[PDB]
Amino acid sequence: ANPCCSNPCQNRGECMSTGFDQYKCDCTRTGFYGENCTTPEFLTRIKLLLKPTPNTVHYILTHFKGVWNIVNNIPFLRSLIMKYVLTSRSYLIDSPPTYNVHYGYKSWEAFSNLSYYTRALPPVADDCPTPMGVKGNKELPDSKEVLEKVLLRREFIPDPQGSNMMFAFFAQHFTHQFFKTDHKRGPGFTRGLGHGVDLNHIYGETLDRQHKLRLFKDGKLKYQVIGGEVYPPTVKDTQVEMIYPPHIPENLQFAVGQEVFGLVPGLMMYATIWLREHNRVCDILKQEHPEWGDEQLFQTSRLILIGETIKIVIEDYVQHLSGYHFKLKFDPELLFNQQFQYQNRIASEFNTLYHWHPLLPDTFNIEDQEYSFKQFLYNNSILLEHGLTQFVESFTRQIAGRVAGGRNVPIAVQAVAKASIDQSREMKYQSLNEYRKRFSLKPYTSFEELTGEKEMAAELKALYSDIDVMELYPALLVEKPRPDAIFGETMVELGAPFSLKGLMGNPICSPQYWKPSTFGGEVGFKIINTASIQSLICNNVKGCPFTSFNV
Amino acid sequence: ANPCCSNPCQNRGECMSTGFDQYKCDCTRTGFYGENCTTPEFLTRIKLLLKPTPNTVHYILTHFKGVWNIVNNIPFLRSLIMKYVLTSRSYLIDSPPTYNVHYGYKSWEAFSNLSYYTRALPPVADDCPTPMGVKGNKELPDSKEVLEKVLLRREFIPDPQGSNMMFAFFAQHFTHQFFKTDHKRGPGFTRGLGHGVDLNHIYGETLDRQHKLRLFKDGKLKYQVIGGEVYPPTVKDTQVEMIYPPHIPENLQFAVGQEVFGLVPGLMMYATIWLREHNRVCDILKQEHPEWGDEQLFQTSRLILIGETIKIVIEDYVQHLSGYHFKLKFDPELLFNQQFQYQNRIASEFNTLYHWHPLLPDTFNIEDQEYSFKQFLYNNSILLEHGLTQFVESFTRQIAGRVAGGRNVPIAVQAVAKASIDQSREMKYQSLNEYRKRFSLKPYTSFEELTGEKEMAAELKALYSDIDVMELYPALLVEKPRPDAIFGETMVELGAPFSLKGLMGNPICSPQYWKPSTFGGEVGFKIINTASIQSLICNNVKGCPFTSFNVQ
Ligand SMILES: *[C@@H]1O[C@H](CO)[C@@H](O[C@@H]2O[C@H](CO)[C@@H](O)[C@H](O)[C@H]2NC(C)=O)[C@H](O)[C@H]1NC(C)=O
Ligand SMILES: *[C@@H]1O[C@H](CO)[C@@H](O[C@@H]2O[C@H](CO)[C@@H](O)[C@H](O)[C@H]2NC(C)=O)[C@H](O)[C@H]1NC(C)=O
Ligand SMILES: CCCCCCCCO[C@@H]1O[C@H](CO)[C@@H](O)[C@H](O)[C@H]1O
Ligand SMILES: Cc1ccc(Nc2c(F)cccc2Cl)c(CC(=O)O)c1
Ligand SMILES: Cc1ccc(Nc2c(F)cccc2Cl)c(CC(=O)O)c1
Ligand SMILES: *[C@@H]1O[C@H](CO)[C@@H](O)[C@H](O)[C@H]1NC(C)=O
Ligand SMILES: *[C@@H]1O[C@H](CO)[C@@H](O)[C@H](O)[C@H]1NC(C)=O
Ligand SMILES: *[C@@H]1O[C@H](CO)[C@@H](O)[C@H](O)[C@H]1NC(C)=O
Ligand SMILES: *[C@@H]1O[C@H](CO)[C@@H](O)[C@H](O)[C@H]1NC(C)=O
C-alpha cells in the first residue's frame, strides 16, 4: 500500500508519501536530482569516474608489500593515508542517528531512546506486499532450508588468513560490550546504553554493579587468588548477578562486568586478563600519584583501558583482519582538522554483520584435550585446570573457521544461526542489494556472482528466485571471499564504517580528552599508545607466553 | 592540601598533581606553554592583538544602524556575519563534556552519567583551605548580608531595553525544559536527560507521561474546551502527575509536559499556546498527508515545533535581548562546512546564569488588575478569567526589571535568590574572575570596575575584601550594565556560547536532519523557517493580538 515500499529513491535520497499512491524523493545533498535522485550533477559525474571500486582499493592495500614497507616507515605518509581511511569510511554513517526498527522516518523518539539499536537502512513498512517491499514472493524461503543448504558446515573450512582462537574470543569479548540485546523487548533493542567502547563488560553497565565489583582501595577491582593465580571474585562475595546453571560450584561462579561471560571459558580468559590489567594500571598510577585516592585511581585506570582496547582493536585486531600491508594507526590527532562527530549509536546491522558463526571450530583444543561444545559451555574449571598460560598458548595455535565462502556454520550453533535469519526478518531488514547500494556497492546481478561458484548459487536461486530478494545475513556467509581472505566484499565495506565510527567516536578521542593529563600524565598516556595484544598477555599472563591473532 | 587549589594553570591549561605538594600543567593545544601555561606561542600573541575586546564587538553590533540596514539586506553578507557569530561562540564550550559537581578531573562517570549537569569549570576541591581555593577568608560572607545590601530591590528598576512579561515568561517557559533540577539528588543534578530543546515541557520527559498526554488521534495532544476555548486536559483525566497545592480544585489542575507549569499562570499561558500550536500543525500535516497514521503525525509535529522554538529563540528572543542591529538568522546550513559537534550537555553554570530574578515585576498586571505574588501563585482561575488574548495584550505592555545594575531582586523571591547564592557555594563554584578568564575575559581589578559605581562597591569590598574571591552569581546581578542594556559583560559572554551550543547542537540542525522530508515536506519545513513569536500567538490566540518581546 505504501508507495515507498519499492524503495524508489536511489543514492541515499529520502522517500516520503505525498498521497495514498504517490511519493516524493528528497535528493537534498545527495549529489543527484530528479524523481528518483538518479540524475547526477556535473561534479558528481566527475567523482564517479575518479573513484575506484572497493575491490581495486583492497587489491592495492593487499599488494606491493615492498612499497608499503616504505610508506609505513614514513610518518607523514602513513598519517595521510590513515587519515583518508578514517574520513572516507565515517561519512557512510548517519551521525546523529536516524532510524530504528520501529521508525522508517525520522523522529525524536528514534533519536532520543537509547534502548534501540539504530538502523543504517529503515525497516520495510508493515503494510508492504512482500517482506522485501514489492519484489519476491509473498514469503521468504524457509530459514531452516537456507541454513542447511548453504550455511551448515559439512567439513571444517579453515581461515586462509590463519585467524586463531585468540582472535575469535577477543572478537566475542570485545563486541559483547556493545551488542547486548535486550531479549525482554526484542532483537531491535539493546541494554548497552553507552553504545560503544565503555568497557561495561568489565566494569558493569550500572553504578551499583560497578561498586560491587570494586575493592574501593587503590582504585582496584575485587578478585580472588586460587593456586597463586588472580581470578575474578565470586557471585557469593560480590552479590552481582551472573548467569550460571545452579550446579556450578561457588568458587567457579566468577563475577565480572558482563553477566554472560561465565558461559564461555574463552570469554572468562579475557575477562581475567583485563581484570589483571586494570589492577596493574592501578599499581602504576599509584606509584606516580601517591597523593591520589581510590576513586581517581579507578576512573583514570578505566580511561586508560578504554584507550588500550581501541589501540589493540585497530592496530592488531583490525590490522590482521584487513590483510593490509599498510600499517594501521590509532591516532585521534588525524581527525582534529577534519569534520567528524564524536558520538556513536550501535547499528542493528552491525550486530548482524558480526554474527560470525562460521568462526567457531569443531572442537576447542587446549593443551592435550579437545573439548566439545557441551563440555566447554559453563565450565570455568577448564580455565583453572590448565591456567591462563596454557589457554593463551593453546588458543594461539588453534585455527578458526572461514566466515565467507558458504557452508561453514558448525551444527552445534545451528539454532543461533537460524535465529539470525529469523530476527533479521522480524526486524524487517531490506535486501542485500539495497544494503550494498546504501554503502556504494554495485548490486549483484546473479547468485553466481554473489557466491563465485555454481552449486550454492543454484540452491539459493531455487529458494529466492530473484537476486534482489537475497537476504543480507545469509549472503555474508556464502559470499565469494576475497582472494585467500576470510570475508567477502560486503562484510568489509559495511562493517568497517560501523567499526571506525564507534572507535574514533569515543569521547577520549576528542581533542579535549586526548591529553596526557586525562590519563594521569605521560606514564598513563604511554600505556595507551604502546598497548598491544602481545603486551597485554605479557603483562597479565604468567610466564608471559607469546600470542597473536594468527597461527 | 591539593596542590591545584590555587587554580595555577592558565589559558585553559589542565592542572594535575604529581605529589602531595606538586603539580603539573597540561598546555596541550592551548597555544601557550611554560609552568603555568602563560608563555604565548608565536601565532598566539599575533591573535592577542588582532582580537578585539567583547565590549568593542558589542559596540559595533549596537551602533551604525544605517549600515546594518544595508548589511541585513545582503544575504551573502548577513549569512557570513551570522556564520561568525555561531562559530566564535561555540569554541568556548567543551563538547563532549568534561567535569561535573563530583569530578574535577575527566572520568567516564562524569561523561556517561546524564543525571549530572556538566561544568564549564571543575569544582574547587573539598580539601582546599578556602571556598575559592586559597584566596579569601575561611568562609565566604553571609549570603543574607550580600542579598540585602546589593541584591534586594528598593525601588523597581525597569529594563532600558524595554523587555516585557511576554519575554520574561517565555524565558521561564523555554528554559524550564532543560533546567530541571533533581532536588532529591542535589542542585548539581538534572531530570532533563535530553539536555536541550526536546520540548519535554510540552510532551513529557518519559514515554509513559507522553502517551497519557496524547489523544492518539491525528497525532494530537489531549485538550479540553472551556467557554469555547482550548486548554490543557486535567490531572484527573490523564493521570499525569502535576505539582499543585491541595486546595486547587481538580477542574483547575491542568496537565502538561512540565509538572511545575501550574505554579505560574504566565507559564500555563505558554503551555496552552504551544499545545494549540501542536494540534494546529497536526491539522496542516494531515491535509498534506491523508495517508499518515496518528504516530507519524504526532512525531513530525514535534520535530516542527522543535524547529519553531529554535527559530523564535534566535530571531526574536535572542534578537531582542542582544540589542543587536544585525539581524540574527536561524540557518543550520551555515555550519555544514564548519567543525561543529551536534550534541550538548547542559552546564550547571548556564542554569546559574539564567537565575534572572530581577526580571520579575512587583505586581503582575492583567487588564486592570494588579495581582500580588500570593494571588498570582497557583491561580489558573486568573487565566480562565481574563483569557489568553488579554494575557498576551497585558504581558506585552508590562515592562520587566533590569537584571544587572544591582538592587533589583524583588523581596517576594528573596529566599529563592539566597538559594542561588548558597547552592553555588554548595556546588563549589570557582570565583567570578576565574569564570571570566575561562571565557576569554579580563579579570576585574576592583569592585568599582565591576559595578561601575562606588556605593555598592564599598559594600562588597567590606564583605569579600578581595576581588578574586567575588562570587559569580551575585556579580551578575550587580555588574555594570552595558550602555542602556539589561545585562553586563559577564552575563552575555558566558551565556551566549552555552545558548547557541544548545540550539544549533540539536540533531535537527544536522545535515541528515535539516531536510524538507524530515518535517513532512516543504509545507512543514516552511513552518519552521517562517516562525516567529507573533505568528505563534496570531495562529493560536483568539483575535490575533499584536505581541513582542518589548514594550512600545
Ligand atoms: C524506548 O522505547 C521502548 C519501546 O517503545 C519503550 O518501552 C515501552 O514503554 C511503554 C511505556 O513506557 C510500555 O507500555 C511498553 O510495554 C514498552 N515496550 C517495551 C518493548 O519495553 C521505552 O520506555 C522507551 N524508553 C524511554 C526511555 O522512553
Ligand atoms: C549518576 O550518579 C548518581 C550519583 O552518584 C547515581 O546515584 C547514586 O546511585 C547509587 C547506586 O544506585 C546509589 O546508591 C546512590 O544513593 C545514588 N546517589 C545519588 C546522589 O543519587 C546514579 O545512579 C548515576 N546514574 C547512572 C545511570 O549510573
Ligand atoms: C551438513 C548437513 C547438511 C545437510 C542438509 C541436507 C542436505 C541439503 O544440502 C545439500 O547438501 C549437499 C551436500 O553438501 C549439497 O551437495 C547440496 O547442494 C545441498 O542441497
Ligand atoms: C563486520 C566487520 C567488518 C570490518 C571489520 N574491520 C575492518 C576490516 F575487516 C577491514 C578494514 C577495516 C576494518 Cl575497521 C570488523 C572488525 C571491527 O573493526 O570491529 C568487523
Ligand atoms: C545567560 C544568557 C546569555 C546570553 C543569552 N543570549 C544571547 C545574548 F544576550 C546576546 C548574544 C547572544 C546570545 Cl545567544 C541568553 C538567552 C538565550 O540565548 O538563551 C541567556
Ligand atoms: C523512478 O522510479 C519509478 C519506480 O521505480 C519509475 O517508474 C520511474 O520511471 C522512475 N523515474 C525516473 C525519472 O527515473
Ligand atoms: C568440565 O571440564 C572438565 C575438564 O577440566 C571435564 O573433565 C568435565 O567433564 C567438564 N564438565 C562438563 C559438565 O562438561
Ligand atoms: C606559576 O605559578 C606558581 C603558583 O601560582 C608561582 O609560584 C610561579 O612563580 C609561577 N611561575 C611562572 C613561570 O609563572
Ligand atoms: C485567585 O485569583 C482570583 C481572581 O480570579 C482572586 O479573586 C483570588 O483571590 C485569587 N486567589 C488567591 C488565593 O489569592
Nominal resolution (angstroms): 2.4
If asked whether residues A27 and A124 sit together in one domain, one would say no
Residue A335 touches partner B, C-beta closer than 8 Å: no
Distance A376 CA to ligand 7 centre (A): 8
Write out the three cell numbers for B221.
Answer: 495532544
Q: How many CA atoms lie within 13 A of B277 on its CB side?
A: 30
Q: Is A354 a catalytic residue?
A: yes
If asked whether residues B207 and B275 sit together in one domain, one would say yes
Q: Which ligand is nearest to the CA of A367?
A: 7
If asked whether residues A11 and A146 sit together in one domain, one would say no
Per DSSP, the three-state class of B403 is coil
Residue A104 touches partner B, C-beta closer than 8 Å: no
Structural domain span for residue A486: 42-551
First to last CA, chain B: 57
Per DSSP, the three-state class of B353 is helix
Q: Which of B292, B512, B518 sits opposite A94 (nearest CB)?
A: B512
Contacts of A511 in chain B (CB under 8 A): 29
Pocket of ligand 5 (CB under 6 A): B 318, 321-322, 353-354, 491-492, 495-496, 499-500
**Residues A507, B111: contact at Cβ < 8 Å?**
yes
Q: Which ligand is nearest to the CA of A23?
A: 6
If asked whether residues A164 and A17 sit together in one domain, one would say no
Q: Do B16 and A517 touch (CB under 8 A)?
A: yes
**How many degrees, rounded to 5, is the angle at CA A27 between CA A23 and CA A32?**
125
If asked whether residues B414 and B507 sit together in one domain, one would say yes
**Residues A444, A470: contact at Cβ < 8 Å?**
yes
Residue A96 touches partner B, C-beta closer than 8 Å: yes
If asked whether residues B361 and B400 sit together in one domain, one would say yes
| Closest approach atom of ligand 9 to CA B374 | 14
**Residues B280, B260: contact at Cβ < 8 Å?**
no
Q: What Å distances lie between residue B175 and B29, B371, B502, B508, B523, CA to CA?
A: 33, 24, 11, 19, 28
- How many distinct helices (H) and strands (E) make up chain A? 24, 10
Chain B 489-508, CB below 8 Å of chain A: which residues?
A: 507
Number of domain units in chain A = 2
CATH of the domain at B363: 1.10.640.10
DSSP 8-class letter at B480: P
β-partners of residue A105 are none
If asked whether residues B412 and B325 sit together in one domain, one would say yes
A291 min Cα distance to partner chain B (Å): 5
Q: Do A289 and B18 touch (CB under 8 A)?
A: yes
Question: What type of residue is A546?
Answer: F
If asked whether residues B50 and B107 sit together in one domain, one would say yes
If asked whether residues B100 and B183 sit together in one domain, one would say yes
At A370, give phi and psi (nearest 5°): -140, 80
**Interhelix angle B54-61/B489-504, nearest 10 degrees:** 70
At B475, give phi and psi (nearest 5°): -65, -40
Task: Report the C-alpha gap between B18 and A290 in whole angstroms.
Answer: 8
Q: Within its chain, how far is the Cα of A431 from the centroid?
A: 21
Task: Report the C-alpha gap between A233 and A201 in whole angstroms.
Answer: 15
Distance B318 CA to ligand 5 centre (A): 6
Q: Do A513 and B28 touch (CB under 8 A)?
A: no
Task: Report the C-alpha gap between A237 and A259 in whole angstroms.
Answer: 15
- Quick one: which H or E segment has residue A273? helix A265-288
Categorise residue A186: left if φ over 0, alpha if ψ from -120 to 50, beta otherwise.
left
Question: What secondary structure, in 3-state letters, does A185-204 show?
Answer: CCCCEECCCCCCCCCHHHHC
A21 min Cα distance to partner chain B (Å): 9
If asked whether residues B381 and B477 sit together in one domain, one would say yes
Q: Where are the alpha helices (H) located in A292-333, listed in sequence order?
A: 294-312, 319-322
Q: Could you say which of B116, B244, B354, B429 is catalytic? A: B354
If asked whether residues B114 and B246 sit together in one domain, one would say yes
CATH of the domain at B27: 2.10.25.10
Write out the three cell numbers for B316.
Answer: 526574536
Q: Within its chain, how far is the Cα of A388 from the centroid?
A: 25
Q: Could you say which of A99, A103, A203, A354 is catalytic? A: A354
Task: Report the C-alpha gap between B147 and A159 in whole angstroms.
Answer: 75
Residue A211 touches partner B, C-beta closer than 8 Å: no
If asked whether residues A152 and A101 sit together in one domain, one would say yes
Residue A294 touches partner B, C-beta closer than 8 Å: no
First to last CA, chain A: 54
Would you say A324 is a known binding-site residue?
Answer: yes
Residue A306 touches partner B, C-beta closer than 8 Å: yes
Contacts of A517 in chain B (CB under 8 A): 14-16, 24, 26, 28
Q: Is A105 a catalytic residue?
A: no
Q: What Å distances lie between residue A464 and A430, A459, A471, CA to CA?
A: 14, 9, 9
Question: What type of residue is A472?
Answer: L
Mutation test residue for ligand 4: of A85, A499, A503, A504, the one with most atoms within 8 Å of CB: A499
